[PDB]
Chain length 218, copies 6
């Protein structure tokens, strides 16, 4: 990744064994649950395209998901090439060549070119552009991997209300891929059990979740 | 977070993998015991709003508490807008735009903007303001996960007095959001709910006894 | 804590997760054995009062001990307000009251300013003294046995008995009377060998003599 | 490694104990799975030829693979000698670290223009490790066939895991046709019903069952 | 400890939590096996007297050994005093100053970073290691004379127990007098081979001769 | 060890706890498998003689090997004294000075940072590695001549044991012994390949 040194300059630094083992562990233990995505975004803070490909290359299984992520990256690189064409000719002195999509994805660019773009003034943040594409692809994986539907989650008989809300917003997080509403508010009350659903309407309009869960505490 | 450079300048550092894993382990082991909050504040020392959002996003379960946490933050952000409205217009050179509630919460602000606010002269501590709101919502969550009232904490017939006082003040800590409270009534409620053997010894000590004297007396 | 920047400059730093987890693990495993106190002092090296309150606040259990700790802190702060009872000259800082040392009515900026002043006032070191004074009481409380009740078993090795004698003595005292008390409660066999060595014998001589 | 300092200068650091431990534990757990190669490349960031030999020397088992690795390195080194026939430029044995000192390696890596003997040697190592991953792959891609009761996702998992070990981590037309051709007769109908050029997300939403 | 700053000046640093935990673990898993002493010296590299007292204070059990160590420290501080009985003449440390019982950290650093320096931490560590050597010897269970090769014991396992026992009995200080005992206590089959090797054989040759 | 600060100067550093614990755990786990030696050389990067004695002194068991190591060190130090006899000239180290038995830390640093340096730390590490090589060869349970492919053993497993054994003890002679000690089935396939076959070719021809 690109970090700041003691001269106030941005310089390249090798990716650390801890960051690599942390990314491997969250994938082994949590597959593609929605919370994996912010963890990926945090562990790849300051990453170059080479680093992002490194982290993605340490995933041993889930190869169908990885191939989908590649097809998503290829569609974002094609759109980048449409909106930002590369002009022919020699590069102005002290400047970098224009990055095409395959440069941002680290397939046709060198590490030194990635450093050049990311530390230029102004910087062309090819690590952040590529990471947006990867998170777009991973969000589509989180939805495809989600088992139950938000419509399916209905409260049990003797199940406490807080456990039903737990399963509710967890499934909702996988359905929207951690994207954040009276639509989901009315689904919560509708799919409850008859005992609490009666008191929920009696609370009034636009009650807070705190108020709802105090009303169905017992 | 934003840390002191060896030069002495406030500069942005990435959130460390050790910090991320520490917060994940605290939530999975301690759930929402009261001591989780000072651990959250200590692990998020110097955090930007983006870091705070990152720590909350690593929480896998407790999604009910997380939705309730969002609702507390929205109510604090709406209150920040009422007190500090944004003066419309262009921003003077070398200045930052006035932050609104969603900027402090990190939903309509960028990382570069949060860095500018926190390292400005004088600083606008959008990271500290956001953490104050998060702790307010976490206070509610600690009370919700601690259902047992302090009135229902009663020493068992053969329970050691020290274990009874432990359950008493840990229950009192969740109810009172870890706020320091000197109050005679709770100190007499402690003696009121001791078992008959230690209650006899405590009354034979006289009123206004310190906690150390009380625990020494019921050491048997 | 307040640490050493390479420019000889005193800078504030966040408590690391390693220190936080270390102090938590020490209390969970060792409770309040006497060795917890020097571990707290060493883990709080260079601490502002806010840092000390943070370490105390991460303790999950032992809330009876923590309430006792507060009662000692309040009684020590009440004595500081006696011995060191408003305008503030430019460049300088206010004078600290007991609640300022404990970090209840003071900020991190006021604390850092006190501990980096040209005439320094170590509010963290004064606070740490108050905390250790309270941790000592908690260690005496948690010691299950008095030093008088430590007696060598009939078949217990002299080494194992002296281990319990001095571990108890450490918690109680958180000397000739201890030496006479040590030989007086050895089992009868070891006892007369101790009387046979004469007085003024080192512990190394005593333990190698009781080896049989 | 030859890494950036803090005053903007390239200096030589000792290999970190945490790095050596991470490499040893990766080999013990993953053996020679395809993901071992990018892991080796990330942990050898900036390494000199001496550092690379150190990493390979910490491998305890797999001494058959380590000997094939040596034979790949010898082939690359001999080809380097032929392509660079006789500032003294490094020979193949110099790049491999058998005839060069640590000072000569640093002097090559930090010259201007540099001769990156660490990156060259790492290229030969990765080429040798790729032949080992390919050799130790259990199954050919042509024998991956969807089970009658196997969910389509699990079949695509095995297909690309096998293809990664076969092609040694290198959308091809022969693979897109092979994936449809070896699916069970039920999903193979639904796939050809979508038409040509369907995305994998479309093919897995259809045969989601 | 006292460490080097990039400014070239010797600065004081807080003892790290990883160093503290490493020392607590060593004492808990090895007790007073001989190799604990070199691990203690390495973990206390650069230590001040205050740091050395911290490491000793984190030892949980073994309080009989800790009291023995104090008695060794007092004796060395007394001998130091007997061996050490102008405008700007620096006050030199007493035995209690080196041990840290009567000196502040500021005074300790003053001696350690003076020109010329007085390494009170290295002097104190010298006394501690002496007392630790005494504890290692006393804690050694078996005498070197009772180390005998079993009838079906491999020669290498016997030599392992022999030299490990010898290390505790000598506290890791430095002989054909040991080679004689090694040969004499080998079982009859390996002893016949060792005699046939003639005198002056290396250990390497002895273990290769007794492998079958 | 001796590492450089941010002034281009070589400075002394306390050996770290993480390095010490790593070397202790290496000896506990792997004993004296051949890879212990390059692991030692890597963990003692830049070490002084005092730091090398520290690493060896923290080994708990294997005292038979540790005494063998002392006898190897004594032989190398005596040979150094033979090859450097006594005759603003700097005093040069003796064998006991390189081993750290008669030299202080300040003298070891003075040698290692002098211009030009006398690297007593690297010279000592050379002697120690020579001694560890004898130990690894000693601990080697089986001769290379006794590694034979079982009648049901996969050829890859036989080659794994063969080269792991050859590594502990230490080429056309080895390629002969590898083919000679294979079971009669794979030995027929190997001899039918002809000369010049790589190990990759041999393992492919006998993978069945
Ligand atoms: C309302 O104020 C906001 C609103 C958005 C944010 N941002 C920018 C975030 O990234 C927040 C941070 C966050 C996480 C938390 F667990 C609890 C909080 F209080 C805040 N994360 C999510 O939205 C992702 C998420 C978590 N669980 C879900 C359930 C269903 C779903 O569809 C999405 C989610 C901050 C403040
Ligand atoms: C009277 O002296 C004070 C008073 C307040 C403080 N401040 C500023 C704190 O943050 C202290 C730090 C602290 C923690 C500790 F566990 C033991 C100590 F001795 C000090 N935190 C708590 O009090 C929070 C707390 C813990 N358990 C409780 C049970 C019931 C309850 O209602 C609250 C709590 C310092 C000194
Ligand atoms: C005599 O020389 C001295 C005397 C005092 C010190 N100081 C300044 C200390 O802090 C020492 C450091 C220390 C600890 C150790 F376990 C072994 C050592 F050898 C030294 N700690 C204790 O006294 C605390 C202690 C431990 N066990 C006890 C049993 C009974 C008791 O009442 C107290 C204790 C240094 C040198
Ligand atoms: C031919 O190209 C070379 C040749 C030598 C080197 N040097 C300078 C090394 O230090 C190499 C590094 C190495 C290790 C590896 F496991 C695989 C590689 F490909 C390279 N180590 C060994 O030779 C030690 C060794 C490991 N197993 C053995 C089995 C039998 C034996 O007798 C010795 C060994 C580099 C390149
Ligand atoms: C199409 O966009 C690209 C294309 C190539 C890259 N580069 C430069 C890489 O190194 C990528 C990084 C990567 C990994 C990932 F698992 C998922 C992603 F989306 C990206 N690795 C692989 O290609 C190796 C690989 C993994 N599984 C396979 C299955 C079969 C196979 O034959 C090869 C592979 C980046 C972007
Ligand atoms: C002969 O060359 C020397 C001689 C002395 C040294 N010095 C200065 C040491 O500190 C050495 C370092 C050392 C340790 C090692 F395990 C193996 C080595 F080769 C060297 N330590 C010991 O002697 C302590 C020791 C370990 N096991 C023992 C068994 C019986 C016994 O009575 C003592 C010991 C270096 C080189």
């Amino acid at each position: 990744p690109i970090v700041q040194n003691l001269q106030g300059q941005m310089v390249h630094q090798c990716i650390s064994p801890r960051t690599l083992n942390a990314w491997v562990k969250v994938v082994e233990e949590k597959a593609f649950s929605p919370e994996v995505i912010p963890m990926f975004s945090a562990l790849s803070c300051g990453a170059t395209p080479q680093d992002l490909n490194t982290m993605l290359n340490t995933v041993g299984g889930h190869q169908a998901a990885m191939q989908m992520l590649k097809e998503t990256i290829n569609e974002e690189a094609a759109e980048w090439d449409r909106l930002h064409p590369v002009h022919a000719g020699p590069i102005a002195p002290g400047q970098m060549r224009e990055p095409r999509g395959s440069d941002i994805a680290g397939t046709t660019s060198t590490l030194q070119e990635q450093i050049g773009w990311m530390t230029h003034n102004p910087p062309i943040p090819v690590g952040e552009i590529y990471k947006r594409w990867i998170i777009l692809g991973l969000n589509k994986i989180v939805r495809m991997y989600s088992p139950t539907s938000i419509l399916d989650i209905r409260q049990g008989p003797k199940e406490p209300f807080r456990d039903y809300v737990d399963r509710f917003y967890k499934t909702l997080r996988a359905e929207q891929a951690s994207q954040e509403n009276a639509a989901t508010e009315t689904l919560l009350v509708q799919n409850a059990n008859p005992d609490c659903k009666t008191i929920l309407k009696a609370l009034g309009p636009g009650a807070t979740l705190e108020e709802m869960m105090t009303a169905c505490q017992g």
